[PDB]
Design brief:
This is part of a larger assembly, with chains A (123 residues) and B (169 residues).
Chain A (H helix, E strand, L loop, with lengths): L9 H17 L1 E4 L1 H9 L5 E5 L11 H7 L4 E4 L2 H7 L8 E6 L4 H17 L2
Chain B lengths: L1 H8 L6 H12 L5 E4 L5 H7 L7 E9 L28 H12 L3 E11 L3 E10 L3 H4 L22 H6 L3
Antiparallel strand pairs in B: 1-2, 2-4, 3-4
Classes of the chains: A alpha+beta (123), B alpha+beta (169).
Chain B binds three RNA strands through helix 1, helix 2, helix 3, helix 4 and strand 3.
RNA sequence: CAGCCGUUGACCCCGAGGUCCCCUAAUGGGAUAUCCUGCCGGGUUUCCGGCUCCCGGUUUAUAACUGGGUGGGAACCCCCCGAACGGAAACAUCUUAGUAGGGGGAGGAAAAGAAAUCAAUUGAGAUCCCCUGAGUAGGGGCGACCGAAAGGGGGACAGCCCAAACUAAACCUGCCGAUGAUAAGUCGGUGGGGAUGUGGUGUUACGACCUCUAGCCUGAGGUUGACCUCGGCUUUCCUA
RNA sequence: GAGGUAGAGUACCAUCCCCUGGUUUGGGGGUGGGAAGUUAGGGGACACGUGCCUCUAAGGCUAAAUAUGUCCCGAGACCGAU
RNA sequence: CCGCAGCCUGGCGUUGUCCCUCGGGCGUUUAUGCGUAGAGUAGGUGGGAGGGGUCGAACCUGUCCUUUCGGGGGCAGGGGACCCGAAAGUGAAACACCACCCAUGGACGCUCGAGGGACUAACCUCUCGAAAGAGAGGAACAACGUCAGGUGGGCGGUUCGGC
């Protein structure tokens, strides 16, 4: 679409979905776009996960710019149904925010480094 | 809330008006009255009373802009009553759009509307409609007034929001 | 004319049932035929059920199947479209008149209705109807003509509920079994929804509501004077 | 005491048409432009400025007081077979 | 006497991407000027008789542009250094230097327009396709909405004095 800023290789996306599953069991997460933006506004999120098949696009089109100015990393995921499954829901989710990775602190730190270098080559 | 940021991207004069132009190209080919899966503007829908339960439906209507389709009289008139141009329906196109939606969906009651787009020949509106016979709506305490037969087909008697505005109320 | 029913309580009146031809919104298909003619299911002579525009579901996907507006009414009511005759001693702006009429939508009443209101030295307090204000302010070939509101006196005289801030599945609903007076509800099992937000809190202005911090204020209980948990109140559902 | 929230092609402006007592002042519609958003908005008979006064649009619901007469009861300085 | 349709034309909207040219302006950039009387190109208002002069001048000899070829404006060398008057004429004099104006042309950065050209993705037309979608041609014009001017017995209301 248009709110997708940089390309994410498929091998990195599976790491993100694994981090969500681990963070839910030990740490805290926020499910849904109403709870995700309020965590970004309060500068409480550690990693923001955004789906790639949201219709209409206006639902999540403000998240990339909002967390750019709050200095919060963000990454993309292809399917929202899979993202909803990872966070233990019977329905889809368009955005998730990791309050504290918990058992996935190392796995989250690996992801941020991978994302930061992708944006560096995207100008 | 995220609903505050929905209205900011769709606000006034924006790069978003490049995304919205692309949608119009598709909307000109679909039928004139269509059911849509989800509201294009959740901020406007949720304020007018739309919920994510079953029995709420969303309909998009396009009408043709301009003045009234008025014919020149053919019998004898004084010069005051012989003019055609400049007439518009005292009913607004927003109220006209709600009426055409209530014809195609005779079992649902109109709850509100807002427009979504506009081009050189049409105007597009989206109407929030609810099924008053579904057991989910029938048991809702906030819509218990909708079990009165006088509160049905209100759009035809000017009791909606667009009708009150046009009645001078 | 002829016959029968009724004291084994008829006729008649009131209440409750049964049968109820065809056309008709007419509705499986057709009717310039008030008459014809199908395809599925059931017992089975007869016969009885099912067969546009939408909504929520099932099943392989345009196949099929389960469950759920249309027309009428003497007048009254709500909304759009909308004349001329006549008067001006002619007549075109005007008036007649948003009348007559046309189209759509209801109910036993409709519609309106809880101030982004009025008026004037800081007052009143949702809507509607009657007597007034008043042929006043005001419009008009300033011609014919048209025409308020506030205020005063009365009749009735209620007020809520959402979006948002704070929470984040604590939520709604179809079917089956039990319990409950076959109700509401409670428990158990299955299906559809719902993070693109279901449920809770909360909706007012020299301020209202929400969150945090600090300090003072029914009963029982626990904890460190302070904190928390169960007993009144508010709103809603229900019928034997 | 500190912080947070309050309804958009909407309000408003120019122009055209119809209504209106609404008149350089009111309402609705068509065409074009188009906000602020609590350190906010609206109103107080031309327009603007300064005080003062007053209210919170753009989301619904709401008995009683009243309108009618196919119909049922009663009444009457009504008519009395052209 | 008037109206109203239809038609013609222009503005605004749908309506977008690349150019080029021209005309306006804003802060700059500059070099160019003969009614007559007279050493002779007084276009005008002033400071200003001093200004330039190894703080390098008047002068011969040519290349060159121009003009009512009148004549002035710029070139380095040969010259190692000179001229205007405070003096003679002009309803208005000093090429004594410096300023602004009238007035020519070009250039920088910005704005506004106006015109011309190209393109394709809006829009339109056709074909294939049950639809979904695909192809060809035109093209920001046409078409449509709205406003404005013109034309307009095509159609409607009327008036067609008196003695």
């Amino acid at each position: 679409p248009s709110y997708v800023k940089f390309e994410v290789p498929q091998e990195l996306a599976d790491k993100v979905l694994e981090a969500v599953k681990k963070a839910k069991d030990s740490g805290k997460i926020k499910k849904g776009t109403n709870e995700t933006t309020k965590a970004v506004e309060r500068s409480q999120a550690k990693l923001v996960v955004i789906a790639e098949d949201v219709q209409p696009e206006e639902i999540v089109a403000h998240l990339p710019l909002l967390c750019e100015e709050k200095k919060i990393p963000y990454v993309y995921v292809p399917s929202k149904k899979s993202l909803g499954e990872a966070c233990g829901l019977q329905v889809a989710a368009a955005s998730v925010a990791l309050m504290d990775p918990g058992e996935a602190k190392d796995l989250v730190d690996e992801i941020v480094k991978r994302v930061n270098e992708i944006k560096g080559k995207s100008s | 809330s995220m609903y505050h940021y929905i209205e900011q991207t769709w606000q006034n004069k924006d790069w978003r008006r490049s995304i919205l132009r692309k949608r119009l190209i598709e909307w000109r080919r679909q039928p004139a009255i269509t059911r849509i899966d989800r509201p294009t503007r959740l901020n406007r829908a949720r304020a007018l009373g739309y919920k994510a339960k079953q029995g709420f439906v969303m309909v998009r209507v396009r009408v043709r802009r301009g003045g009234l389709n008025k014919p020149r009289p053919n019998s004898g008139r004084r010069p005051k009553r012989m003019g055609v141009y400049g007439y518009g329906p005292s009913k607004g196109y927003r109220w006209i759009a709600e009426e055409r939606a209530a014809r195609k969906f005779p079992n649902l009651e109109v709850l509100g509307s807002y427009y979504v787009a506009e081009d050189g020949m049409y105007k597009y509106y989206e109407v929030i409609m609810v099924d008053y016979s579904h057991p989910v709506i029938r048991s809702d305490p906030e819509l218990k007034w909708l079990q009165d037969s006088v509160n049905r087909k209100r759009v035809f008697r000017g009791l909606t929001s667009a009708g009150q505005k046009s009645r001078g109320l």
